[PDB]
């Protein structure tokens, strides 16, 4: 009778089975959250939090665990670069275990409601029909959720009762889970202020409480109850989808563009920090304040932290990889070992040449060596016959500063070209490609993958809103149109559109 | 180091016999439901 696509509409009429089915769904979801987090703990390498963070390893579930305060693990390692004796119940393993308990307990509860659909609670008093009073149920759920939102903001983010939230600095060198005083002014609507997140859930949770109290009491009017069809449960579904993909364009937007809710050293740097050269300007400012302190150059560059140099790198872009490149970034180019050094390229006149870095569009950009005012002193030729700007003609020399290759000139023309190709992309490091047999070719961040799936899921959920937004409004004509429509489909004789009370 | 087609030989050696024996069960439950005429045909 039922086709394969209508196959779940059997649970519409029985509200006792909806709860049986939502419990099986919430057992699969939390079962996934526990089992994927256990999988990630088997893959995770805590040995280097500097050049091997969680986003470098393709950790999708772990950044969501640490951004609300799970920093420690039962293996003794802390993610904040500490050493803890006793993490307690709440570690990476304990959170992952707690979702498997919840998966098992919601599984059993799902069976209990599927066996017992005959709960009296789901019956109308007036008629005998199985019926759910959707405006009272909403007012219950809105009160709870607004209560829980207020409790989250007031007692977890502000850290009265809870541990706080991951709050990093501007450049992702240091961050730690700490409480946050809420920011009530216009500063709260700055997305990069984590005080907005505390002040959000307090204030939005307050309205979630007092709109709960409103909907617990006030009944709908006839005009909304007839139009919006609040006796129909699918009107809840369509309107809920609209809230769910609206929330996905917001999360996948603030994922890709960054916010205080999705910080750098947790999910990876954004795309737009490579575009402006967001870390270059921080490298060069910290060098200028070191040479203004009186330092010579080769120890001016060695004071730059390695983690900051890791962020000014192309293989750390979300927009660098591709779809069917599967897995961590370390399967892209390898485990990072150490910063080599900052190349400075000089010509025969003692000027300074910077290789023009590549945009995120190009898989390949050539090697072009430009000076301070952006005029080409050198390149690497494709056609090598009549080239005027080849490195062997211009005689470009290489001198490094800092890192493991500190203070080493290279006047050797091949190696000048080799480090010219390396310096085109990123700050040049030395990797380990032999650990997992990493290829020579890039990947993408959890910041790339989160807003990939969710900007697509929000599109499919736009269609599912129009499907159920359509099916509720036209619930009666879902199985045919009748013969009564033949009179009302006529240009004229009704001066309104379809209404038999006219003429 | 672990052998290669064993990821295939286990999982296709589970699921293809497991899903087969499901369907001799799904066949009867439909056949016993088609026998006694209820809401299902």
């Amino acid at each position: 009778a039922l086709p394969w696509y209508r196959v779940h509409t059997v649970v519409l009429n029985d509200p006792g089975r909806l709860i049986a089915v939502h419990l099986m769904h919430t057992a699969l979801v939390a079962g996934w959250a526990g089992s994927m987090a256990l999988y990630e703990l088997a893959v995770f390498d805590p040995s280097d939090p500097v050049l091997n963070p969680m986003w470098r390893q393709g950790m999708f579930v772990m950044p969501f665990m640490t951004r609300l305060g799970i920093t420690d693990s039962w293996g003794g390692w802390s993610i904040t670069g500490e050493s803890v004796s006793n993490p307690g119940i709440w570690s990476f393993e304990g959170v992952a275990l707690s979702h498997i308990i919840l998966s098992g307990m919601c599984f059993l509860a799902a069976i209990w409601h599927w066996v017992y659909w005959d709960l009296e609670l789901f019956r109308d008093p007036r008629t005998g029909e199985p019926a759910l009073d959707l405006p009272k149920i909403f007012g219950i759920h809105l009160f709870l959720s607004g209560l829980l939102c207020f409790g989250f903001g007031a007692f977890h983010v502000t850290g009265l009762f809870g541990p706080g939230i991951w709050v990093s600095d501007a450049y992702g060198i240091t961050g730690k889970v700490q409480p946050v005083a809420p920011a009530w002014g216009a500063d709260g609507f700055n997305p990069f202020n984590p005080g907005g997140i505390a002040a959000h859930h307090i204030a939005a949770g307050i309205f979630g409480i007092f709109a709960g109290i409103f909907h617990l009491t006030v009944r709908p009017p006839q005009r909304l109850y007839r139009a919006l069809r609040m006796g129909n449960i699918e009107t809840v579904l369509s309107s809920s989808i609209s809230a769910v993909f609206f929330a996905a364009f917001v999360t996948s937007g603030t994922m890709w563009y960054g916010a205080a809710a999705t910080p750098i050293e947790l999910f990876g740097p954004t795309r737009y920090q490579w575009d402006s050269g967001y870390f270059q300007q921080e490298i060069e400012r910290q060098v200028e304040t070191s040479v203004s302190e009186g330092l010579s150059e080769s120890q001016a560059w060695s004071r730059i932290p390695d983690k900051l140099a890791f962020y000014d790198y192309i293989g750390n872009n979300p927009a660098k990889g591709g779809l069917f490149r599967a897995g961590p970034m370390n399967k892209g180019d390898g485990i990072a070992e150490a910063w080599l050094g900052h190349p400075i390229f000089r010509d025969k006149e003692g000027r300074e040449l910077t290789v023009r870095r590549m945009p995120a569009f190009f898989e390949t950009f050539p090697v072009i060596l430009v000076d301070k005012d952006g005029i080409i002193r050198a390149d690497i030729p494709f056609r090598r016959a009549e080239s005027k700007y080849s490195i062997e003609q211009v005689g470009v020399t290489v001198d490094f500063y800092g890192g493991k290759l500190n203070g080493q000139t290279f006047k050797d023309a091949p190696t000048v070209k080799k480090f010219a190709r390396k310096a085109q992309l990123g700050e040049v490091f030395e990797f380990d490609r032999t650990s997992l047999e990493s290829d020579g070719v890039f990947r993408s961040s959890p910041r790339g993958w989160y807003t990939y799936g969710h900007a697509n899921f929000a599109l499919l959920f736009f269609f599912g809103h129009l499907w159920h937004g359509g099916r509720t409004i036209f619930r009666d004509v879902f199985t045919g149109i009748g013969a009564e429509v033949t009179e009302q489909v006529e240009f004229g004789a009704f001066q309104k559109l379809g209404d038999k009370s006219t003429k | 180091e672990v052998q290669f087609g064993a990821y295939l030989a286990v999982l296709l050696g589970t699921f293809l016999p497991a899903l087969f024996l499901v369907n001799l069960f799904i066949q009867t439950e439909a056949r016993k439901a088609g026998k006694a005429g209820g809401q299902d045909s």
Binding site: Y39, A42, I111 | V2, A6, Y7, V10, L11, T14
Partner: peptide, 30 residues
């Protein structure tokens, strides 16, 4: 990555036993 395959099959048998105890076809006297 075969420890996935090991724990999928061990928990796989533990699932099948759970359905075999609690969702069995009951025998009737009739």
């Amino acid at each position: 990555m075969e420890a996935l395959v090991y724990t999928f099959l061990l928990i796989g048998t533990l699932m099948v036993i759970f359905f075999a105890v609690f969702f069995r076809e009951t025998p009737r006297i009739l």
